[PDB]
Specification:
The structure is cut from a larger assembly and holds one copy of chain A (about 20 residues), one copy of chain B (about 90 residues), four copies of chain C and one copy of chain G (about 1350 residues). Chain C is mainly alpha-helical. Chain C has one helix spanning about 5-10. Chain G has a domain at about 825-940 and about 1040-1050: RNA polymerase II, Rpb2 subunit, wall domain (OB fold (Dihydrolipoamide Acetyltransferase, E2P), Beta Barrel), CATH 2.40.50. In chain G, helix 13 runs antiparallel to helix 15, helix 27 (about 1105-1125) runs antiparallel to helix 28 and helix 27 (about 1105-1125) packs parallel to helix 30 (about 1185-1195). The chains are: A mainly beta (about 20), B mainly alpha (about 90), C mainly alpha (about 25), G alpha+beta (about 1350). The complex binds magnesium ion (MG). Chain C: This is DNA-directed RNA polymerase subunit beta'.
């Protein structure tokens, strides 16, 4: 999601990418 | 054998000292299983010909100097020489 | 296919694996 | 071929958690090693232009 | 990583990239080093020619 | 040098130089003994090998150590590498007058200071403590001063107060990336063993409170103290160097507090009434008569530097809420009320401080940020915000979307089973319809939750 | 219904019934080391296996032979406790019977046999641990590439062609590898190891195979003959599958195929009805084929054509005129049956067997002359010698299985058939048939353990000694030397000690929590010997493979440089017979889930389809759904009701022990769940183990199976309950007929652990209580009544509180630090060492210079602090002085000493004093003294005290034993009567005189007398042994006179800076210790313990902490209702009804117990232990749903939202916006702020380079290059200069700056740093002249 400390593996393609806490 | 006794030591020791050390090692091998655990710190001295307190002297010496760059336990590459302070 | 090293390869002036050509 | 149909408000079953574990491992490894690679890049960047 | 080697004062080049060949090259060239810039001043342990020291250094480089 | 237990410690250099000397002397002896050419050639090759192993071990057979399986550290091995005397000593070095500890919050601090434990500051400032004690005559000599601090007599704490007042300290976190990874603060003596770091600087440090430890250093010389106060000071560094955006932006709790403060519901206590100003708003709220958020009109005095640089002031009746009126008391003189009439998202809570710095300067912007953090923490506490199991929405449409999706998957399984749609095309189509269903469920739950009220 | 669970029962939610009980947790360690050290009368692994592998050892054909008979492990020299006290290795001597046999130039063979001692081998404790040097150590199991065959692709990257090469790899357990690999030209290449490449066929020639037999082996053949003219073909009707016709057919007057029209699948079946066995071919079709066998002329013997040759009409005319009827040709088809080996032969530079052997030898040992004997010997030794190569049982099994064989066991050496079949398989892969393997498939990943690695290291020792033994057997005489002469203990003991003492897999027990012990003993690692490194890999192996299911925990691995390499073992995982990983499954026979369990390896599980753990079956095990979620082939999807082969046993078998303890794990993200499971091992044991208010049900197994607790050997009644020991009287049913006695458990008291924490056992039973077998008799640290209590459950409110909980920081009330419930006890072991300096021996006497007598008031007459005396930093624990002389003092000091007449003592102070910043009480002092060299006085006092204490201990043992035995004698004498009372009158010593008439129990009286006197003399030899151990001069290092060990007991409370964490990955550091008055409270006035940050919940995405909070709130409400019932004491009835109502539910459970059949006295104790709160069990996936949580909240008086109103303790006004309060189980990790806090102004300095690191850690946090850049970005130059010149490296500058600082003048005369000077000297040591130029 947000507040980048671990990445978000799960998303629709094209989103920048989280970078989630 | 003479060259190994002479120049194979960081601390050169007289050759007869090295031969006496080897004789002590032979005695310890001889009486290893004989006395059960390892023979008592006195009887192997009487096995020898010396005044028999020479055993602890010769055992105190023959400590080979440990490398200063030996990595300290559980970590690389923190080295032993880095922990020797200055007195 | 690479997120962050997309900058390192660029900075190192490393050419692409299969480069294009430009007339003189 | 079968997206997760659960949320953390509900209770996930074995398959969904086992499949999410893949992405969790991938991303955590990316962080752990990319940080060192980024420090390496910072060092190269300071050395080229610091004077 | 290649333009970093194209630095006159070799001490920085040896602080960074592989020290052996750097020293050998600069030594066969008889390369002399007036230690301009920062990193080599950091090596030798005197004032930085950038910050406050610049003034001081501007007094010396002109001298 | 001798080590404990009678054993000795030495660099392997000694072994290499030993081999060089031994083989050179043996070569001299073989020369004096008129040895055949095979033996003397073998000895020349061996001496070359030994010298090369001494200079740089690695381009040859990599001579083994004595009773140790690892290779021996040569001279080039001493120089080069990430652990040679270049990377590990000359560029970076261990430093005296330094310490480190776990860090805590300390919200009561103003921006230009940090909480410092007593024992750490005592062990750190030892020489200045001795000097001040013997200067004030409280100690006969330096030995007596060391005895006094080792006894930890009650008089030396005031001397530490004296030596700490105008003496800044430097704080640093382990992953130092930009220059704001190190910042200067003013010491504040604290009971305990943890360092108290101002929260607004955490964003500059990337420092969580999840066990992260930080280190402190003491500027000794006068030049170092002045460089710390004028350059590395926390107040002097607010704008990032990479971009003009501020680095002191409120992070999480204060942003929440200000968001809950400045906001309007459709109805609350005393909606639509009128008040003389923000002080009346505080009197109303703190007495429980009026709610924090309520659509109100209040007379407010805003200020504008105008027409020559001379400050003018105008009052008016503004449409706002009670929270924004109360918050207006903190806003420095020059800013317009329009900045506090919105909902105050984080993105805008940053632009507020940005405009404050661009208009009024650094001196006010610092105290503005301090008061912002104070009121944000205070009202985020007062709000009683929380999170429960029922705070999460679950649309009932969710299962209907799931059901339509799985009916579609059984349809496509019908069609693919009877060899009509190809394999890859059918797989891509399943992927597309599942992504569409995910978007549908997301939009359904978002419309259910966003304007649920 | 055990007599424990009557004290406390844990509410277990959910439906899924447990089909299989949890296995012994420490299975792998104990089982593996039991298999290593064992007498197995065959080649199965163990000492016998390696012995048979290396033996018999024979001389260099002198046929003086040395064969192995049998071995034995003597009794250990020191037991575990005394090996720990003294510091020696807990090992057993190895006595092996060898036989030296000789023959002479008849049968004249003469044999001589003797047993020889070859070193001592370590021994594993009952808990799966070893004692190498006075320290418990654990050897982590290893995971490596399984031996056998493995087919890989290496597609993509290679050659930028889009054409992928196919390679195979034979990986032996020991010996040289064997790689086969194609190239873009489809030429098969071979390589013994990563050495030079060579054509493949060159090996087949080495196996005595000419071109003829190679072509015969690899290629199907077609017959070609010119039958009186006009060349024809015997091709089979199937050889046309997918071919292009180039000719016309005229068979049987019909025309099947024609030029231009190729052959489809139609002509295939067309050639059946016509029964075509012959078809003519023109001269343009054979002109592009091959010829298998050689063909010479029938008159002159001239080579018309050789083997593997092309074809042309010009050669057809040559063969036909010479009388050549039959011709052999080779199947082809670039498409399906590729002509790879033909081209490979065309790239072969050799011709015959030895020509290939020459090239092979010159490849292996290049640059030197090859030889026939040398080449033959090297080739036979590479893969066909029993000595230098072994494809052992695991590798042989995988080799045969991956090659579609039948026999799963075979010789460990390679055969010609093996290599030929591997090449056939690889060519089949290149032909589009069969699929390649992957390194990460667990069938190709093999688990080692302590036993197998010990076997390999012992094998290394054996092969090491074997060379020298053969060397002595070269020049040996006939009868003077015997086994012991050749064999020596140094090689074997050296190998085993090199494995145990120094290895990546031999670690210290991660001993600061029992769960840590259990999950460390159950641990894997691909690192270390024979393993990849963090620098070598990489991601493919780190990632979780689909075959990780049920065998390795997918969510328990350390986060750092080595991720995915240190996976933990699953709950139900086992060591396969061949050392693989197998998981349990339930056989779905037809449509029924039988209680029968089957253990499946990763490969076995592969082709089957396995059902799901969570699956709805009812009344029989029949699937209630027509289709259920399953997983068949590396993927998962929905399957019909009756296509399933197996089902998951339990819902937990995927996770390990650490993950299984996380409640509501279905509600936590894998990353934060991983971090919670990782930190749960870092939990330091609390002083008061409370319990998990929210649990799972696995804590009991972890607490029991761990050696921390004390489990009753045999059930009965407790005779004696002391804090020191527990004596249980055994029931007669469990007791053997002889030596009746009782079970005495000596509880381990306060002693040092590995993480400097404390370990102490406490009795959990009362005096005279019924105990069961397999029941907990004492609680170790962090265990409550047999349940694992890693931390404490406490009240938590999720609300931001004045920023004091900013990021993850924790805000704790003063009530917690007052209740001392999170206090910890640390045991620090300090040592003082009197050595033999060159100037003389060091003394321990209390005589000390430069100190006040009041400061030494705590030292005894000999110089050691009294036991129990509290000490602070600087207090002298052990007085010690070092001989010194020639102070060589300067004039001013001489004048001072002359004026004041003060003797300057020659001795330097080195006495062991308490470190800075720590304080505690001394609990134990012990002393180790060299042989007979004279005692300290306190040394005699300690030895005599140990003597009398040991005699008292042994006396108590013997007295309880005699009491039990004479009670049984009295009982047996009552059998047959005489006499009831008057027997009691005679002295008990005069009881064995008494005999009875004819009896079967007279023999029993004899047994009791025998055991009696056996113990009577065994105690005596035990007392003599213990007295000898106390009285002997302890053994110490060279040149050290004596050692004194003091044990301080520091008691640390929680304070600002300590790290804490829940069980879900919720980090946190304490921010402030707040008074109880300032804490938020609810309407009832009960304050809250902890104030968490709600913001830490959504970002980190661990909602399981909120469910744990709500459910703990609910359980505490139940417990509060129960305590209210206790105070307003009603009766057994109301309390029992309330407990039963709580225990059923609204929702269904698999607990379903009981109707409160337990007695009134039993139910009251249950309610008494439940008044603290109701411990709940949340299964990992069978856990409580939200409906059940709200329903349980309804039983207490607590809202559905779990949210109540809170009031600020400062202003008293209410908090708007209802908050989330509850009871969360949290742990205090051992990152203590009085362990991380360090400070230094001026300390010691390193000698090689003048840098401050010395010793406790000192020196600043090394000012790295990044911090130098941070200073350079600022305009701060003098800061950096004084940083790296005055404060750090200038030996002159530091002191010349200290003097100016104390003088009140802040300046600096910097000079040059010492590291730069050392570097100048190091450069000038080379042939490099570095100088310093102009002024
Ligand atoms: Mg952090």
């Amino acid at each position: 999601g947000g507040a980048g400390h671990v990445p978000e593996y799960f998303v629709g393609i094209g989103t920048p990418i989280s970078f989630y806490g | 054998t003479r060259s190994i006794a002479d120049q194979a030591r960081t601390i050169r020791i007289p050759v007869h000292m090295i031969e006496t050390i080897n004789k002590l090692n032979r005695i310890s091998r001889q009486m290893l299983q004989e006395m059960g655990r390892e023979p008592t710190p006195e009887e192997l001295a009487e096995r020898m010909l010396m005044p028999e307190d020479k055993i602890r002297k010769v055992l105190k010496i023959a400590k080979e100097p440990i490398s200063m760059e030996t990595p300290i336990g559980d970590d690389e590459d923190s080295h032993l020489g880095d922990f020797i302070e200055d007195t | 296919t690479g997120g962050l090293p997309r900058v390192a390869d660029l900075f190192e002036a490393r050419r692409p694996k299969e480069p294009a050509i430009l007339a003189e | 071929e079968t997206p997760i149909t659960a949320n953390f408000r509900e209770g996930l079953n074995v398959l969904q958690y086992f499949i999410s574990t893949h992405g969790a491992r991938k991303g955590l490894a990316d962080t752990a090693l990319k940080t060192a690679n980024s420090g390496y890049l910072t060092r190269r960047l300071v050395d080229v232009a610091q004077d | 990583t290649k333009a970093s080697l194209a630095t006159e004062s070799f001490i920085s080049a040896a602080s960074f990239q592989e020290t052996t060949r750097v020293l050998t090259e600069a030594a066969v060239a008889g390369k002399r080093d007036e230690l301009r810039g920062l990193k080599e001043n950091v090596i030798v342990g005197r004032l930085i020619p950038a910050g406050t020291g610049y003034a001081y250094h501007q007094d010396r480089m002109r001298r | 040098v001798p080590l404990d237990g009678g054993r000795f410690a030495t660099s392997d250099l000694n072994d290499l130089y030993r081999r060089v000397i031994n083989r050179n002397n043996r070569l001299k002896r073989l020369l004096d003994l008129a040895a055949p050419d095979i033996i003397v050639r073998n000895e020349k090759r061996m001496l070359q090998e030994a010298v090369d192993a001494l200079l740089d071990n690695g381009r040859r057979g990599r001579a083994i150590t004595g009773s140790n399986k690892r290779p021996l550290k040569s001279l080039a091995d001493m120089i080069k590498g990430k652990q040679g005397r270049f990377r590990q000593n000359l560029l970076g070095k261990r430093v005296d007058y330094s310490g480190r500890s776990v860090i805590t919050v300390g919200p009561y601090l103003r921006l230009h200071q940090c909480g410092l434990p007593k024992k750490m500051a005592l062990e750190l400032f030892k020489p200045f403590i001795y000097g001040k004690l013997e200067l004030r005559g409280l100690a006969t000599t330096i030995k007596a001063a060391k005895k006094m601090v080792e006894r930890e007599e009650a008089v030396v704490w005031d001397i530490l107060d004296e030596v700490i007042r105008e003496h800044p300290v430097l704080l640093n976190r382990a992953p130092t990336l930009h220059r704001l990874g190190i910042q200067a603060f003013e010491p504040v003596l604290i009971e305990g063993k943890a360092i108290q770091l101002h929260p607004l600087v955490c964003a500059a440090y990337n420092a969580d409170f999840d066990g992260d430890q930080m280190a402190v250093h003491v500027p000794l010389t006068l030049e170092a103290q002045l460089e710390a106060r004028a350059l590395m000071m926390s107040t002097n560094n607010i704008l990032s160097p990479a971009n003009g955006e501020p680095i002191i932006v409120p992070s999480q709790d204060v942003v929440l507090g200000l968001y809950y403060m400045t906001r309007d519901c459709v109805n609350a206590k005393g909606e639509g009434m009128v008040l003389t100003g923000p002080k009346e708003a505080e009197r109303l709220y703190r007495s429980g008569l009026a709610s924090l958020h309520a659509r109100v009109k209040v007379r407010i005095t805003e200020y504008e530097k105008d027409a020559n640089g001379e400050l003018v002031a105008k009052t008016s009746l503004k449409d706002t809420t009670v929270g924004r009126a109360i918050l207006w008391m903190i806003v420095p003189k020059g800013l317009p009320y329009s900045i506090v009439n919105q909902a105050l998202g984080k993105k805008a809570i940053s632009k507020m401080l940005n405009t404050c710095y661009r208009i009024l300067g650094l001196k006010p912007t610092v105290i503005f940020a301090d008061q912002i953090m104070y009121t944000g923490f205070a009202y985020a506490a007062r709000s009683g915000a929380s999170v429960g199991i029922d705070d999460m929405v679950i649309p009932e449409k969710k299962h209907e979307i799931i059901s339509e999706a799985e009916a579609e998957v059984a349809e496509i399984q019908e069609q693919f089973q009877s060899g009509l749609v190809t394999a890859g095309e059918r797989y891509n189509k399943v992927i597309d319809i599942w992504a569409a269903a995910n978007d549908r469920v997301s939009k359904a739950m978002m419309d259910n939750l966003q304007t649920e009220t | 219904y055990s007599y424990t669970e009557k004290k406390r029962i844990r509410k277990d939610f959910g439906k899924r019934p447990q089909v299989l009980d949890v296995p012994y947790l420490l299975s792998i360690q104990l089982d593996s080391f039991q298999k290593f050290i064992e007498q197995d009368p065959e080649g199965q692994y163990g000492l016998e296996a390696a012995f048979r592998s290396v033996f018999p050892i024979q001389s260099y054909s002198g046929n003086s032979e040395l064969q192995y008979v049998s071995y034995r492990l003597g009794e250990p020299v020191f037991d575990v406790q005394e090996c720990q006290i003294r510091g020696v290795t807990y090992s057993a001597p190895l006595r092996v019977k060898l036989r030296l046999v000789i023959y002479e130039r008849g049968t004249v063979k003469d044999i001589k046999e003797q047993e020889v001692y070859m070193g001592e081998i370590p021994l594993m404790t009952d808990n799966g641990t070893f004692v190498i040097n006075g320290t418990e150590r654990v050897i982590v199991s290893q995971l490596h590439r399984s031996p056998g065959v493995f087919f890989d692709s290496d597609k993509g990257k290679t050659h930028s062609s889009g054409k992928v090469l196919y390679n195979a790899r034979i990986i032996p357990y020991r010996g040289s590898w064997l790689d086969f690999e194609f190239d873009p030209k489809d030429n098969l290449f071979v390589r013994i190891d990563r050495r030079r490449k060579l054509p493949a066929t060159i090996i087949l020639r080495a196996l005595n195979y000419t071109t003829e037999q190679i072509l015969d082996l690899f290629f199907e053949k077609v017959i070609f003959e010119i039958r009186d003219n006009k060349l024809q073909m015997e091709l089979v009707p199937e050889r046309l599958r997918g071919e292009t016709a180039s000719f016309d057919i005229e068979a049987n007057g019909k025309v099947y195929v024609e030029k231009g029209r190729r052959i489809t699948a139609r002509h295939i079946r067309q050639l059946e009805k016509d029964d075509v066995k012959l078809i003519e071919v023109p001269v343009e079709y054979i002109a592009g084929k091959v010829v298998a066998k050689d063909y010479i002329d029938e008159s002159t013997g001239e080579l018309i054509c050789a083997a593997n040759m092309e074809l042309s009409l010009d050669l057809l005319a040559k063969l036909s005129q010479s009388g050549h009827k039959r011709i052999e040709t080779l199947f082809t088809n670039d498409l399906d049956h590729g002509p790879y080996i033909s081209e490979t032969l065309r790239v072969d530079p050799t011709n015959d067997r030895l020509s290939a052997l020459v090239e092979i030898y010159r490849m292996m040992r290049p640059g030197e002359p090859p030889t026939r004997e040398a080449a033959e010997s090297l080739f036979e030794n590479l893969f066909f010698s029993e000595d230098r190569y072994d494809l052992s049982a695991v590798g042989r099994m995988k080799f045969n299985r991956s090659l579609l064989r039948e026999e799963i066991e075979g010789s460990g050496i390679l055969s010609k058939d093996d290599i030929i079949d591997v090449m056939k398989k690889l060519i089949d892969i290149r032909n589009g048939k069969g699929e390649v393997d992957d390194i990460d498939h667990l069938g190709n990943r093999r688990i080692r353990s302590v036993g197998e690695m010990a076997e390999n290291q012992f094998r290394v020792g054996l092969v090491r000694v074997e060379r020298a033994v053969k060397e002595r057997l070269s020049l040996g005489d006939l009868d003077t030397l015997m086994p012991q002469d050749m064999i020596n203990a140094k090689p074997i003991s050296a190998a085993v000690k090199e494995f145990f003492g120094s290895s990546q897999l031999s670690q210290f027990m991660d001993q600061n929590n029992p769960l840590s012990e259990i999950t460390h003993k159950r641990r894997i690692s691909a690192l270390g010997p024979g393993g990849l490194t963090r620098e070598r890999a990489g991601f493919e192996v780190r990632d979780v493979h689909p075959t990780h299911y049920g065998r390795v925990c997918p969510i328990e691995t350390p986060e750092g440089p080595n991720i995915g390499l240190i996976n933990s073992l699953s709950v139900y995982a086992q060591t396969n017979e061949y050392g693989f990983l197998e998981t349990p499954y339930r056989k779905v026979t037809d449509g029924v889930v039988t209680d029968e369990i089957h253990y499946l390896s990763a490969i076995e599980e592969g082709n089957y389809v396995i059902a799901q753990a969570n699956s709805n079956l009812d009344e029989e095990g029949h699937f209630v759904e027509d289709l259920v979620t399953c997983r068949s082939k590396g993927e998962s999807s929905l399957f019909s009701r009756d296509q399933v082969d197996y089902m998951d046993v339990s819902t937990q078998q995927v996770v390990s022990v650490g993950a299984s303890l996380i409640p509501f794990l279905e509600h936590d993200d894998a990353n934060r769940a991983l971090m919670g499971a990782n930190m749960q091992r870092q939990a330091v044991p609390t002083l008061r183990a409370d319990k998990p208010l929210v649990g799972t049900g696995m804590e009991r197994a972890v607490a029991v199976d761990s050696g921390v607790t004390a489990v009753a050997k045999r059930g009965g009644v407790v005779q004696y309950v002391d804090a020191s020991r527990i004596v249980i009287k055994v029931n007669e049913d469990e007791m053997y007929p002889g030596e009746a006695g009782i079970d005495i458990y000596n509880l381990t008291k306060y002693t040092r652990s590995n993480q400097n924490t404390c370990i102490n056992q406490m009795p959990c039973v009362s005096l005279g209580e019924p105990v069961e077998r397999g029941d907990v008799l004492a609680d170790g640290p962090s265990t409550d009544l047999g349940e694992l209590a890693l931390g404490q459950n406490m009240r938590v409110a999720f609300m931001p509180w004045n920023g004091y909980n900013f990021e993850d920081s924790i805000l704790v009330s003063e009530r917690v630090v007052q209740e001392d419930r999170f206090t910890t006890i640390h045991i620090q072991e300090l040592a003082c060492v009197s050595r033999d300096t060159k100037l003389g021996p060091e003394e321990i006497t209390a005589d000390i210079p430069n100190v006040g007598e009041a400061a030494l008031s705590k030292l005894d007459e000999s110089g050691i602090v009294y036991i129990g005396a509290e000490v602070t930093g600087g207090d002298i624990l052990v007085g010690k002085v070092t001989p010194k002389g020639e102070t060589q003092l300067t004039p001013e000091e001489k004048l001072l000493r002359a004026i004041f007449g003060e003797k300057a003592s020659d001795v330097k102070d080195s006495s062991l004093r308490v470190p800075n910043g720590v304080s505690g009480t001394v609990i134990d002092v012990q002393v180790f003294t060299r042989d007979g060299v004279e005692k300290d006085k306190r040394a005699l006092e300690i030895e005599e005290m140990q003597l009398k204490q040991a005699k008292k201990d042994l006396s108590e043992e013997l007295q309880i034993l005699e009491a039990g035995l004479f009670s049984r004698i009295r009982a047996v004498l009552v059998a047959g009567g005489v006499e009831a009372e008057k027997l009691d009158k005679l002295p008990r010593d005069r009881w064995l005189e008494l005999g009875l008439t004819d009896e079967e129990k007279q023999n029993q009286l004899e047994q009791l007398a025998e055991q009696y006197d056996e113990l009577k003399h065994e105690f005596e030899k035990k007392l003599e042994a213990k007295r000898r151990k106390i009285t002997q001069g302890d053994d110490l290092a060279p040149g050290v006179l004596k050692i004194v060990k003091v044990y301080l007991a520091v008691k640390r409370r929680i304070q600002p800076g300590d790290k804490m964490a829940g069980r879900h990955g919720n980090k946190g550091v304490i921010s402030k210790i707040n008074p109880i008055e300032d804490m938020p409270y609810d309407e009832n006035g009960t304050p809250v313990d902890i104030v968490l940050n709600p913001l830490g919940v959504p970002s980190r995405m661990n909602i399981g902490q909120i469910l744990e909070t709500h459910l703990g709130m609910a359980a505490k409400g139940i417990g509060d209702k129960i305590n209210a019932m206790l105070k307003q004491q009603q009766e057994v009835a109301k309390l029992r009804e309330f407990i039963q109502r709580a225990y059923d539910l609204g929702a269904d459970v698999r607990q379903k117990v009981d109707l409160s059949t337990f007695s009134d006295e039993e139910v009251m104790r249950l309610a008494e232990n439940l008044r603290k709160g109701m411990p709940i069990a949340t299964p990992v996936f069978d856990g409580a749903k939200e409906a059940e949580i709200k329903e349980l909240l309804k039983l207490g008086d607590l809202p559905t939202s779990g949210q109540i109103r809170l009031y600020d303790g400062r202003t008293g006004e209410q908090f708007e916006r209802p908050v989330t309060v509850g009871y969360m189980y949290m742990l205090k990790l051992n990152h203590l702020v009085d362990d991380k806090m360090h400070a230094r102004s001026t300390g010691s300095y390193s000698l090689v380079t003048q840098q401050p690191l010395g010793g406790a850690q000192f020196g600043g946090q090394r000012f790295g290059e990044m911090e130098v850049w941070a200073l350079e970005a600022y305009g701060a130059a003098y800061t950096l200069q004084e940083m790296l010149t005055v404060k750090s490296d200038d030996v002159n500058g530091r002191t010349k700056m200290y003097k100016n600082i104390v003088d009140g003048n802040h300046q600096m005369e910097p000079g040059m740093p010492e590291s730069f000077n050392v570097l100048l000297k190091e450069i000038r040591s080379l042939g490099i002249n570095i100088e310093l130029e102009d002024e």
